């Protein structure tokens, strides 16, 4: 489409078949995080919403599609000695809702308006990731439909044959 | 340039003047997270690497440029009653190193190779965010130069007048 000084919003996406994985109690020593990502690449699972958070320990979280969810954690567990973790967390009752677009990163107001919209329909955010081209949140599947609606409303979308330049 | 089935890597970026902000002890109730982002938008600070992690409480983390770092936390603190947090964390001795590109998200191996490269020069990852178009990590400023080098080496870049289609 239009593929400027204001952000372009091309749509609202949603995926109901999502899994959330947390590796708990990772040594904060160089090498260990890399093993986590190598294991996932070796197992051929495309991951998203990835983050690291803090003992001398750290946790890593990501999502992936449910269908490969169990394959992910198995691979991960098969390397419990080499990766130093104490626990693997798993949540397959969540879905991802997203604002797609471009140039979103210089306008933090978009993210705030994104969240204000979900809050207004009492949607709870479990994870959030943002980029130039996507703002995604992870929530329970029971709330995906009201989230999509709220987003469409808040941003004047749409078709989605519509795109918008939002101010 | 070239702006395919393999990822395009257009460069390695680095920014030494970075600040890391953590809002600690946020009520996991709809509305509060949105207040955090609204405060930042109101204060006109472009944020990045944003994440939410877990009591009934949650934490949010992000980065921004140092020059506006203190303005961020001030704004945040000015709303300590309305936002429910117990603590604000602040780190201005870190920098961001990034792999720029497109189509990176279907190849988790890139992220793993990214991390393997930093691990090999004993760089510690404090934050990581990934997208189709950027993989960034936050580390101490004392390690930025060796990180940039290691990345260039690992991915056959570059100029950066070079771009690569990596396999």
Curated annotation (Swiss-Prot), chains A, B:
Domain ACT: 21-98, 99-167
Residues that hold substrate according to the record: 28, 46-48, 52, 110-111, 124-125, 131-132
Top-level division of the source organism's lineage: Bacteria
Similarity section: Belongs to the aspartokinase family.
Known function: Catalyzes the phosphorylation of the beta-carboxyl group of aspartic acid with ATP to yield 4-phospho-L-aspartate, which is involved in the branched biosynthetic pathway leading to the biosynthesis of amino acids lysine, threonine, isoleucine and methionine.
The protein, known as: Aspartokinase
Organism field: Mycobacterium tuberculosis (strain CDC 1551 / Oshkosh)
Gene name tied to this protein: ask
Part of the intact protein present: 250 to 417 of 421
């Amino acid at each position: 489409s239009i593929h400027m000084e204001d952000p372009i919003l091309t749509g609202v996406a949603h995926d109901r078949s999502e899994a959330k994985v947390t590796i708990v109690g990772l040594p904060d020593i160089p090498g260990y995080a890399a093993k986590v990502f190598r294991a996932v690449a070796d197992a051929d699972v495309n991951i998203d919403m990835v983050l690291q958070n803090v003992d001398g320990k750290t946790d890593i979280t990501f999502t992936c599609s449910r269908d490969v969810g169990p394959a992910a954690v198995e691979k991960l567990d098969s390397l419990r000695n080499e990766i130093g973790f104490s626990q693997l967390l798993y949540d397959d009752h969540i879905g991802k809702v997203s604002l797609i677009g471009a140039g979103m990163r210089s306008h933090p107001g978009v993210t705030a308006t994104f969240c204000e919209a979900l809050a207004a329909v009492g949607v709870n955010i479990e994870l959030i990731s943002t980029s130039e081209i996507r703002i995604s949140v992870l929530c329970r599947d029971t709330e995906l439909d009201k989230a999509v609606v709220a987003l469409h409303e808040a941003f004047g979308l749409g078709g989605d044959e519509e795109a918008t330049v939002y101010a």
